[PDB]
Design a protein around this ligand. Structure first.
Ligand code: 6NT
Length: 301
């Protein structure tokens, strides 16, 4: 019955958030649960590249406008993204082979989305999933055509477009301190910031198997050692939804001063991409699960 967003605010954090979109807000009990329990919303799909720029320079904002308007009406913070990602890319982007062309396409995509919502978006995920598992840079069209400068260019462009937004890089499999990807993103973000690249946060896209929450207690402090002003947990889900794993992720954020909050990947189990693992905090009747109650109790104490 208690609101995890209200309780995490009382502990000095900024939000407990959730991913959603128009399709969810008009079905189930998603809107009522988000109103009650979550302080920030993120677009599942409506701000990805294939949704917003399906043909070059032919932008479609309908889904994204719906979410932003709903969030403002209901007093919720808004996160946006992903601005630069190799998934959900339209084919017209991935066929460009010219550096100047792709650089201008990328800057225009970033600037157009960020200007439309200027001042209304707390956090933008600027670049996502830029690292391979061995810590090398993922060979996406942006890396292949622009070079490693594409990441500085993307963040510099985003800062100019809306200097009020917090700018994040995001990746998954950052859940263990000794994993090569964890080491690499920390080292590269340190170097980028030392050269003045405006990276405000690292977002950890946390998709856990049973028992992996304990590792986050060590991994998240390591991510925070890169020196960004903020870190966060994003797109969180946990196979089996054990209270032990969920409470460990919450405690990791409570233990890390720069952790501003946690976002879960959805509201109810049946709408998960891995629904067979019942990995979310509400069940198929929209009742809170034991893991939700455990987080409430941990935050109350
Ligand atoms: O936190 N999130 O669940 C979330 C969802 C969609 C996104 N797109 N970019 N960043 C995102 C974060």
């Amino acid at each position: 019955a208690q609101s995890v967003d209200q309780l995490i605010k009382a502990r000095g954090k900024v939000y407990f958030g959730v991913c959603t979109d128009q399709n969810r807000l008009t079905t189930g009990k998603n809107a009522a649960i988000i109103q009650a329990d979550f302080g920030m919303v993120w677009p599942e799909n409506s701000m990805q590249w294939d949704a917003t720029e399906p043909s070059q320079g032919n932008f479609n904002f309908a889904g994204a406008d719906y979410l932003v308007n709903w969030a403002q009406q209901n007093g919720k913070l808004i996160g946006g993204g992903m601005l630069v990602w190799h998934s959900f890319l339209p084919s017209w982007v991935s066929s460009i082979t010219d550096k100047n062309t792709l650089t201008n396409v990328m800057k225009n995509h970033i600037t157009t989305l960020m200007t439309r919502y200027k001042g209304k978006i707390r956090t933008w995920d600027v670049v996502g999933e830029a690292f391979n598992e061995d810590g090398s840079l993922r060979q996406t069209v942006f890396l292949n055509v622009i070079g490693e400068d594409y990441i500085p260019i993307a963040f510099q462009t985003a800062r100019a477009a809306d200097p009020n937004a917090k700018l994040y890089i995001m990746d998954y499999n950052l859940d263990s301190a000794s994993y090569p990807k964890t080491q690499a993103i920390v080292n590269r973000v340190k170097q980028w910031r030392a050269a003045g690249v405006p990276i405000d946060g690292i977002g950890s896209q946390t998709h856990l198997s049973a028992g992996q929450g304990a590792g986050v207690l060590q991994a998240l402090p390591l991510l925070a050692s890169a020196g960004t002003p903020e870190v966060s947990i994003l797109m969180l889900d946990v196979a089996g939804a054990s209270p032990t794993d969920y409470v460990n992720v919450v405690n990791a954020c409570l233990n890390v001063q720069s952790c501003v909050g946690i976002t879960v990947f959805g509201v109810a189990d049946p709408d998960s991409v891995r629904a067979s693992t019942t990995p979310l905090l509400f069940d198929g009747n929209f009742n809170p699960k034991p893991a939700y109650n455990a987080i409430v109790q941990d935050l109350q104490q």
